[PDB]
Design a protein around this ligand. Structure first.
Ligand SMILES: NC(=O)C1=CN([C@@H]2O[C@H](COP(=O)(O)OP(=O)(O)OC[C@H]3O[C@@H](n4cnc5c(N)ncnc54)[C@H](O)[C@@H]3O)[C@@H](O)[C@H]2O)C=CC1
Ligand SMILES: NC(=O)C1=CN([C@@H]2O[C@H](COP(=O)(O)OP(=O)(O)OC[C@H]3O[C@@H](n4cnc5c(N)ncnc54)[C@H](O)[C@@H]3O)[C@@H](O)[C@H]2O)C=CC1
Ligand SMILES: NC(=O)C1=CN([C@@H]2O[C@H](COP(=O)(O)OP(=O)(O)OC[C@H]3O[C@@H](n4cnc5c(N)ncnc54)[C@H](O)[C@@H]3O)[C@@H](O)[C@H]2O)C=CC1
Ligand SMILES: NC(=O)C1=CN([C@@H]2O[C@H](COP(=O)(O)OP(=O)(O)OC[C@H]3O[C@@H](n4cnc5c(N)ncnc54)[C@H](O)[C@@H]3O)[C@@H](O)[C@H]2O)C=CC1
Ligand SMILES: C[C@H](O)CSCCS(=O)(=O)O
Ligand SMILES: C[C@H](O)CSCCS(=O)(=O)O
Ligand SMILES: C[C@H](O)CSCCS(=O)(=O)O
Ligand SMILES: C[C@H](O)CSCCS(=O)(=O)O
Lengths: 250, 249, 253, 246
């Protein structure tokens, strides 16, 4: 019951890491809102999770669209109660170095990751600040802390999220709202993870970047997020928490 | 659940943050060994904690003395079982800038913090590596990540611990032993906290903390309990700031 | 003559830190192209700088407009020779926290800073990679390393630039192109510096800000320019992927 | 003339990166004191550098011995003038992990690196603070910023130096003394580079595609020592071919 009486909205919550966060949050007694670009997916996943009295509801919204994400958060609050937590998990990845990157793809990557974190937080902060109570978890990556070959836009976007997290902590920590970023290492099993992988030598070069000797699971990342959401993390704010199997330590 | 079947040794566990870690670890089902310079204190604190079937044991050792810390860990394991976790919480602080610091006090601060982390870990690692299973939590500080006026030796020591943690993670993460550092902001209530305090200046210190308050031993303990737990299975080499936003600004 | 035979393009080169970089680069023997949103300013400043044999030329371009910045770099190269260095100095700042920031303002700050760095680098990289030779200096800030109250978009943009610099260094350092970021502390005398002051008039906050700087003063455009000159020079041949704090100690405490 | 009117003491100045710093500082018009554990080497290297009117002098001291290093700095100041810069270049490396490192070996690595930086700085700071003018460059490493397998003591020592640099800058920047740390990537050609010389695995960690040279590192130190770096203090400057960027 680490999240007893918490109400948590999770963007990109219909699949992958976001869904695992939802599962773990329900385990700890939270009520959860899954907000996804894919409304049907959010609804199906919410139903799948709604067992043993667990309360999970699905909502459709593109985080880059101010009116849509605002309406989704308002509806979540109307449906399951005033938010105590927001997880800005929605993100997309793509490839392209600065010299040849698709400019339109660049903008979309920056939009979903950075603008989405901005707009979703903006919607949630009205109530959280009014209540002097909230916790926001943003999604960095190892790709926001170091450079990754061939991922210019994504490294820019995640770098933005890491420092935006510090900025938001600066504004809001004293007003009762903690803001932190989890920075995951590679997680193989998700759609994005599969996109990333998509030769014994190449993948092995990648695996060699991880002292722990394996890549992450959605469940590994979810546990870190649940800690940050919980009131046991009451003094934790502005942190960029590396959950990365040692990648950024070497 | 969350530390069911864990066996945790905590250096400097007789008081302050170390004692809070012990209490929280017992809450989560671990068995704990308090290892403190002050043997009597370790014993009294262990006795106080050992209620409701909670198992805590106290041992005396100076972490800077290789034979003594090795013996305490051996005794702990005989009494509560093979270690699954080590918290290198033992540390001391002091004041003095580079131009005027006393060399002997400098050496003692470096010894307790850095050499203690080295020797305690060395002792624990024999067993942990043999079993391919362990978690070590070292104690950095905000003082290991940024410069603090008038605390040269302490900033050096905590800076050493932060990067030694990365180095240890590099060596051992693939061999079944995770190594992480908690980097706490100021916690005023402990013996060390009271030492650092000893009002315009207080208010200036408080303004360094976006959250608007200093930390408690319980705040820090919860982060340590997370890092010790198998729910942190992918977390290694991290320098985790538990600091009310201090290093974020 | 630390930049003899170098040809450097400087975005936002018409005024402020960019103009100070131009002046120092000319001192060290480079030829410089000033590229600024304000074409007249770029041209007037280039004229002012072109004394004693120094060669500076001005060009107008909005760094957020791919065709415009590409055209400016092309004209610059036709005028003063193939680029060996690019300084992505153009940037704008503004105020607003996540809860109240205007989305359009947010986008423009992200565009000039992040998209501008992307688009100008893209233009310069074609030639630099072909020649296996270049150095790119991006502009972070203390605001790209730590959080600054009430500057959400700007902290996001500068944070993007700091890590984009790492990413570009990862791609290009082995191909002959070094990429680094200078992260200046507050420089009061520029238009942006004045913009920052003007945003809070109290002298408690004014002295509060200065107390963040161990060195006991704010930066000058000349202070920042010297670090950029070092990074552009071949004396910095092993320096790449660095986020170099030039900040009077601000991020050290 | 970037260091004209500067007087710079360089610990470990008899060889390797230290000697390269001396050479570049003399190129820029500074007067240099080489301070080395090997006194004869400091003297011979100083003599070699002292051509074309350049002023370099050699002195012997173990930076871990307070009286030794204090006496060398005092002798230096008496011979070439009051210090304006100090480069804490002296350092040693070794191998050993936490589980197997010998405690005496651990202590000597910490001593030369960390205690040496403390003691040499303590000696120089008396004069620098009196004159409200100084610049101190400490030696970190990529090994002070990230973990390096099998180098526990060395990663601890360099980690200490990186944050001690921030601490010193906090204390002294407003009093006229800048303090910075250079953090070099691997430099193969020095005694330490050779000592620490799978090898293709190591090179792959460097995006620039080569290891550093003593000259590469010297140029960064020269910048940090110069008055052109007037606003630079408290910084950990990575000179590392991109190693810590990935
Ligand atoms: N998978 C990995 O290796 C790592 C991923 N991450 C970050 O973790 C987060 C989640 O990653 P994954 O679970 O792997 O992603 P995913 O690709 O498996 O799923 C992302 C979910 O977000 C939704 N989504 C996409 N765009 C959206 C938008 N504009 N508005 C609302 N929802 C949208 C998708 O529909 C999808 O259901 C992202 O921020 C990602 O960048 C960070 C580090 C490692
Ligand atoms: N109190 C604070 O504001 C902060 C403290 N810390 C670190 O957290 C850790 C714990 O701090 P506190 O609880 O405040 O300390 P404390 O001073 O309240 O208690 C520390 C305990 O360590 C023991 N100890 C001292 N030297 C020892 C040695 N050589 N061998 C074995 N045990 C020894 C003492 O007997 C004492 O019981 C330390 O590493 C400290 O540096 C870090 C950040 C904030
Ligand atoms: N002034 C300060 O305190 C600090 C400033 N900086 C950064 O340093 C850089 C330069 O700063 P300042 O000299 O103070 O700025 P400034 O405001 O004095 O001058 C900026 C120049 O950039 C030009 N510019 C603006 N938008 C442009 C665009 N879209 N395309 C082309 N040119 C454009 C302007 O016309 C102007 O001439 C910026 O990247 C800034 O964010 C970073 C840290 C400290
Ligand atoms: N060689 C490399 O790959 C890198 C080395 N470094 C650091 O750069 C610095 C210089 O390294 P190198 O030039 O390679 O070293 P080096 O081994 O080639 O020579 C260092 C000099 O320091 C002197 N020295 C050793 N102990 C001393 C003591 N207790 N007191 C006074 N002098 C002493 C030696 O006699 C020698 O002349 C060191 O601090 C080192 O840790 C850091 C990163 C890369
Ligand atoms: C997409 C996710 O943030 C991972 S980016 C690549 C990280 S690594 O595989 O190069 O360690
Ligand atoms: C003793 C502990 O590590 C705190 S060091 C001083 C930190 S602060 O009060 O200057 O934020
Ligand atoms: C606009 C420039 O990047 C400075 S942002 C504010 C930095 S400080 O004055 O709060 O230290
Ligand atoms: C001794 C010097 O600080 C280098 S430590 C090893 C660095 S690397 O070769 O593993 O990148």
């Amino acid at each position: 019951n680490r999240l007893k009486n918490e109400v948590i909205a999770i963007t990109g919550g219909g699949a992958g890491i976001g869904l695992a966060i939802a599962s773990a949050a329900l385990r700890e007694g939270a009520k959860v809102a899954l907000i996804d670009l894919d409304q049907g997916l959010a609804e199906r996943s919410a139903a799948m999770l709604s067992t043993g009295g667990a309360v999970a509801k699905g909502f459709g919204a593109d985080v880059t669209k101010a009116a849509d994400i605002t309406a989704a958060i308002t509806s979540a609050e109307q449906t399951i109660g005033s938010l105590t937590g927001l997880v800005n998990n929605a993100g997309i990845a793509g490839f392209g170095s600065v010299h040849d990157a698709d400019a339109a793809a660049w903008d979309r990557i920056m939009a979903v990751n950075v603008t989405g974190t901005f707009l979703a937080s903006k919607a949630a902060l009205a109530g959280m600040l009014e209540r002097h109570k909230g916790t926001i978890v943003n999604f960095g990556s190892v790709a926001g802390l170091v450079g990754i070959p061939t991922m210019a836009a994504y490294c820019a976007a995640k770098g933005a999220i890491v420092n935006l997290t510090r900025q938001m902590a600066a504004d809001y920590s004293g007003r009762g709202v903690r803001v932190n970023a989890v920075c995951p290492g590679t997680v193989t099993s998700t759609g994005m993870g599969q996109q990333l992988l998509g030769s014994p030598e190449v993948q092995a070069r990648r695996l060699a970047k991880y002292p722990i000797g394996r890549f992450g699971t959605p469940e590994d990342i979810a546990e870190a997020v649940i800690f940050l959401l919980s009131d046991q993390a009451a003094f934790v704010t502005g942190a960029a928490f590396a959950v990365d199997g040692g990648m950024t330590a070497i």
